[PDB]
Structure 1
């Protein structure tokens, strides 16, 4: 029912970004999504 916070384009865009050392705190705000959401798609075990 409810749509996903981030599709795939940005799902990997983002993913690729974290690898370059970006702060979830910031990514979350740009992309207008909750931080919990991010730690969910990409755990600190990634």
Structure 2
């Protein structure tokens, strides 16, 4: 399978930075992942749906 994009100790690093007020669009080009990845790992609630 492919490699997990945030290299696990970075899941700590991020949880922290975004729960202490950090925008994902920001957090995704410094650690280069896609914003969709970050909402999959650390989400929140409700505004939703589907398709590619």
Q: TM-score, normalised by structure 1?
A: 0.88
Which ranges of 4 or more aligned residues in structure 1 deviate by more than 2 Å? none
The count of aligned residue pairs is 46
Larger proportion of helix: 1
User: Structure 1, unaligned stretches of length 5 or more?
Assistant: none
User: Structure 2, unaligned stretches of length 5 or more?
Assistant: 47-52
Q: TM-score, normalised by structure 2?
A: 0.79
Larger RCO of the pair (alpha carbons < 8 Å, separation 6+): 1
Larger radius of gyration: 2
